[PDB]
Ligand binder design. Sequence first.
Ligand SMILES: CCCCC[C@H](CC(=O)NO)C(=O)N[C@H](C(=O)N1CCC[C@H]1CO)C(C)C
Ligand SMILES: [Zn+2]
Ligand SMILES: [Zn+2]
Ligand SMILES: [Zn+2]
Ligand SMILES: [Zn+2]
Ligand SMILES: [Zn+2]
Length: 181
Amino acid sequence: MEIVEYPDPILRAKNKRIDIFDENLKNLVDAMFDVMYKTDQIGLSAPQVGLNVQLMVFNPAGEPGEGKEIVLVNPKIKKYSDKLVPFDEGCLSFPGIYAEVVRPQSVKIDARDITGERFSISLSRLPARIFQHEYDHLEGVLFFDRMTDQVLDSIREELEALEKKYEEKTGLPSPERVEAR
Ligand SMILES: CCCCC[C@H](CC(=O)NO)C(=O)N[C@H](C(=O)N1CCC[C@H]1CO)C(C)C
Ligand SMILES: [Zn+2]
Ligand SMILES: [Zn+2]
Ligand SMILES: [Zn+2]
Ligand SMILES: [Zn+2]
Ligand SMILES: [Zn+2]
């Protein structure tokens, strides 16, 4: 398996609603989780593994046998919190890049589970901060789109290194560019 890095367009591509809840789905859930623990992270969205489906795995503790193992298919934010908290974020698809993004502190979420059943879970604190990072991905939103103009300028150069690496492995000009904003 592999980790799709910015600027790969898969990270931007539209993401397919999931209709079937079979064994294949559980296997892919399993793999995401195990990629999350391998890479020491607290969540992961399907596009990050090269699949454009509305799928996201999630453990608030980000440690094996700790926290919980949350699966959310076809999620949607029923609402965001009025209060905004800043906080420092990194993302797997942007190796070694860290910086601040300010977000609603809490969220009401509606998703389905791995079986088919439709639930409605409310999140705050670090879980709601992670959920939101991951759900953006589900929408093709990457955390630097959430960053201030000032925060973006610190990481401009490191984002570029990724564009150039992408250009080096593919030959194709980068399909998107931090300088564009
Ligand atoms: C909080 C926002 C959710 C982060 C998701 C990323 C992984 C990812 O790219 N999901 O798409 C992660 O685990 N990032 C970690 C991260 O941002 N963390 C880990 C614990 C604290 C918080 C940074 O303050 C590190 C390991 C880079
Ligand atoms: Zn591989
Ligand atoms: Zn496993
Ligand atoms: Zn850890
Ligand atoms: Zn991410
Ligand atoms: Zn430039």
